[PDB]
Subunit: 276 residues, 6 copies
């Protein structure tokens, strides 16, 4: 039920997208020691650096006392020899060692002040709380296994990850128009564009070889989510306006797709089919 | 095979809930060294901070002696120079170092006093004892793998985790009325509401699912915790529009006729949009 | 071949018990360093704290010399200034520092004396030796992986663990009479009582959901053992003395069991069946 | 089809024995650092403590120099004040500190001398070399994973481990006569006795089994170690009662007749209790 | 069915190539502590040493203050005693210790300056960014598990890894002409040469295979890296001897006749040794 | 088609050999810290100790400065008191402490000189490079997981590992003549002898029980390789010259092999068969 010409070729490829958030981060600090006060739940919206947080801060407060006293000393000291030499009382060598003990005891102050700034947790981006692995009583411990402790990420702006593959990868470039949809609200179709390839076999990012090729786009509302899978198709050609042979020239010039080719050379219209 | 005056549907979805306790925590300390005295058996009711607990406290008592002597010294010292300068005997610089040794030896006292407060265990909430992995003779050790040592949690108030999924997730919101029940006492049905979604694929909390927790108070023992439940969740309720027992079945198209508009159904007992008035030519079979 | 009344209902449930010892502990110390002398085998009866034991004690003896000399010093010292001031010879500040070096050198003595008490092993209960993972030549090492080194536990008093399940758990309470038996001596049947539930899905203690419910009881002789599995049944009801309808009232009032119900309301006797 | 005067049964059980060496040990030291000289190849006969061995000893020789100088000092010192006071020159308090520095610097000498004695390897028993996991160039390292480095064990005297099981375990005791054989030399049969049970499910030492070891001297090479054996174990022996080739087969009940009493059999050649006298009407088929 | 004058064969073998980049490296430093500023996204072209990078540098700046003061001191000091002795004021032994404190405090300055140079990341080659495992908030930590943190490598010049195997390995040497192609652009065929064997079972680099790498310049993006290729490798080429389309098929024996001598074939189009002259009685079918 | 006598029995056993190199070693040092310069590729021939190597040597050069200055000091010092006492100027106790600081500062010199000798890598045998796991940029790190970093071994002299088994192990001794071949060049057959058993179930070296029994032999050229598998057969008997009954004496005296026995007692020749 077909004949000649037009210009509606759409070549497409299709793979299936695992969808994602644009960023996304796990958080637990260089400290050890059990925790005390936990500030969030499930899926809170959180703006920058917040309160999460807090391992018991106890011995770090200790070490603050100890380096702030031994700083009050050296401070008074070289503040006093800051007024000798300025007469010419004692030396220019007794100044070097009063400054040394000062600077050294200020350093060692900003140090254990840091290890207190550790004990306080902070969210590394304004975002939303995915996970909360970790609990008010929880005797965490670092050393060599960072813990994480809160997971959080950004869900306006999401980005989908089309497990595309080894064959069709000489094509799929950037900026190709794509459409895709879910599995959750079939009457929709989302369009976007394709935004970047990888150049990385998605084993190699984070038998059976895929090459992601991310597409981003803003989720307003909270509609989408994150684990989700999508079905997606990606125009790898578009000639508006040449010549179309509903398929079979089988038992010249391309390309064929899907089974519905495409006349370039020469020719022109008017013509035939195959039947049968 | 007519109307329903105007009528009343329940769309529901259903998934299967792994049930849970509201909170729940594992406990074992920053210390190492073997233990000595263990205070609970599973399924003890425990109120706050209690006695669990206790790794052998031996070398931590040592370090208490050693920092409390070296504190008795500096305390006497700068308590003595606290009465010089207040004459004007010795200086204002020999005070700085008597205070330094004091503060420093008080600090290092609160430190090893802390590492004794570690050795003593405490329960991070008033609750009940799930597990007791760990035993009177047991030569535990921290460093880099925290142990836990007691698990304990709260079982009045429980919360169930309906492994719901990728399809139906555009719906299920919060505050939806839900009912569910177990596998253990079939003549029951518990109602509750739905209390929160996640926004998190339940791999990503802790084949694609998205939990959506529902809480509610367990009085008595009754429920438990490992349990699974079967649960169904009203994703619509129109009290009072028009009901076509299903088929006008398809660019959807709808036999007797006219055509209609549509939606929605469930379990296969579709709903009208115009339609259609009352009585009409009812379409079957 | 049946009619009315009585009072022999036994509802029962049944699951299969993995049997156990009441306690049970693994043992290897905070030390490192290879071992030397090992005192037990296979399944010895052992009473408290014994000799197991002993990593090579060598450098810990070293550190005993070193802190016991530096203690002989301070001891002589402040024993000598314990007799000044008691005249009024030297000061009250030279006493503080002689006591300090004393206390400090006694502390540091009880410390490396402890690290020698480590090197000696001890059994944390009068019991019996399950396992002996670990051998006269064996270059063990702690740090962050405790070793264990002997396993030992108590086998008078055993306790069985009936993998019971998600359905029948609204019933099975405590104090229910139970019977169970093995797989090794079929002409027996052991009775006991049920002694505690858990409230813990036996994944959660130490697809497919079970809830243990321990039952203890004394193994005299050594007959039972430990790995064993048992088959067990647990009276979750007993009405002595109401009304019994050999089953089928199918195509009122309960409960039914197994297929052999149970008349409450109203009624009385004399009556029928089903046939057919 | 009569009696057996009085007769002689063997009940047996049978399981399959994984065979073993009596002892057996893995060896690699508290040290780190690469190695240098390796003294054995597998299947060397070795007698006690030998030369294995040797991680590069380099920095441990360093720490020997450094603690042996600082010992030469304190030795000369308090050897000198060992001749004051014995006049009455200098004090009784300057002796305390010369002794302290002495003892302390002898201690710290026996310490780094020890960490040299580590660097040298030694075989924890006179025996034979199973394995040699570890090589002349091999940059080993301890800390928290002890290495092993040579495995060695004793192969005169071996001991076989009959994966026996949950049923038959109420029987099999110690001192039962056993026979077993391999898979490698079928015309043999080795007898021994059974020497110990366990009381330990062979998951729990190191589908339910309970080992029950049997030892015996391997002279020559002959046996080996990975081997499996097939073994059978007399759990009864009545020399001299009455034997009914099996069936009176069932509340057990026993055809010709009369009835009997019973037990026991094996492999299906049952035994009488009364019974039954001599000759009788033999029941078959 | 005759001769080939003298004729021209291609034996080939074939295996399937996993393709690769020439180099390729993972990068994350000796430091610990969380990060702060991250400079790249995957698939950035990067030239040498760049900005990646940066764990929070905080306490390393601290230790810079502390060792640069204690250096200002000793510098002034021995700069002052650099002008004694050059009179002859104080000694030649008070110089030794002023130099010692100097050198020692310069050393400990280059040390903590180093641990700041750590905190800054750098790309170990001019190349392109594969991976970016690691994120602006990410609380990394070293010690004993190096992290990596960026992966990057070189994609002009790629090299393909033909999982070739245990049989054909006595052949395939180096410098053999090869052709191969993908799975993604079938109208192509890439030729190259073979550039090296391994001598290493490709389990042992990083069912038995032996890689045998072939390199060649990827200009443009075109290829990629995960890819598989299908590749065939001329293990013989006699231009110009005699060709018997196969069968004289067997102590091998060769119908029409006479007999021949033989080899070799492929895919089943065998070759003569005498044979046989021209024309002859061609054997079929 | 057979009769009596001779002396061509060959009993043989057969198993399949995984072949190997005689030695073989993995190499990466006690250091940490990233690397810098890497000297080899794929399969280089390398003679002893070479250049491989080199983690960035930076802070180890630091610690060389620091202990070589503090050595220049003590060296000058006790070189100066080496000329007192030799008059009789200052004491015999001030010498002890000048020597102490000297020896101690020489020790501490050979120490950080060692930690520089670490940073330089060296091949633990003249051989060939199997593997090169590890790369110019590679931020390696030891502590508790040695890295390895180059793998290298010897491929003249190879040694094959005949997964032989639990049955036939009462036989296979040493010095038995063996032949074997590959899978890669069928027209060959290599002979060798058998050179050692193990006494070790090849799980136990480095359901289903094998016992290796190595055979070595020189690979000249580079022909063999290493991953390879071989098929091998091993004469466990050879009587040249007794009496041979093509098999079946079935429905005396052995042994039988394969199905082609072997007359000892008594007898003599001339005789029969089985047919049928």
């Amino acid at each position: 039920t077909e004949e000649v010409k037009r210009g509606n070729i759409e070549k497409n490829v299709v793979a299936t997208g695992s969808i994602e958030s644009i960023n996304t981060v796990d958080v637990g600090a260089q400290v050890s020691g059990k925790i005390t006060k936990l500030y969030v739940k499930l899926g809170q919206q959180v703006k920058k650096g917040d309160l999460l947080a807090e391992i018991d801060p106890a011995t770090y407060e200790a070490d603050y006392q100890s380096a702030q006293a031994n700083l009050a000393s050296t401070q008074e000291q070289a503040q006093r020899y800051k007024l000798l030499v300025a007469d010419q009382a004692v030396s220019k060598q007794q100044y070097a060692d009063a400054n040394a003990a000062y600077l050294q005891s200020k350093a060692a102050v900003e140090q254990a002040r840091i290890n207190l700034r550790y004990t306080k947790i902070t969210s590394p981006i304004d975002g939303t709380v995915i996970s909360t692995p970790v609990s008010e009583g929880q005797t965490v411990n670092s050393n060599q296994t960072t813990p994480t402790i809160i997971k959080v990420a950004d869900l306006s702006k999401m980005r989908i990850k089309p497990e595309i593959s080894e064959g069709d990868i000489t094509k799929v470039k950037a900026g190709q128009d794509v459409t895709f949809t879910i599995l959750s609200d079939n009457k929709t179709v989302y369009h976007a564009k394709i935004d970047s390839v990888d150049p990385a076999t998605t084993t190699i990012s984070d038998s059976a070889v895929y090459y992601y090729a991310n597409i981003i786009v803003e989720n307003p509302e909270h509609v989408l989510r994150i684990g989700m899978t999508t079905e997606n198709n990606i125009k790898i050609a578009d000639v508006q306006n040449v010549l179309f042979i509903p398929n079979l020239a089988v038992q010249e010039i391309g390309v064929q797709n899907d089974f519905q080719t495409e006349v370039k050379s020469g020719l022109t219209e008017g013509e035939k089919v195959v039947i049968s």
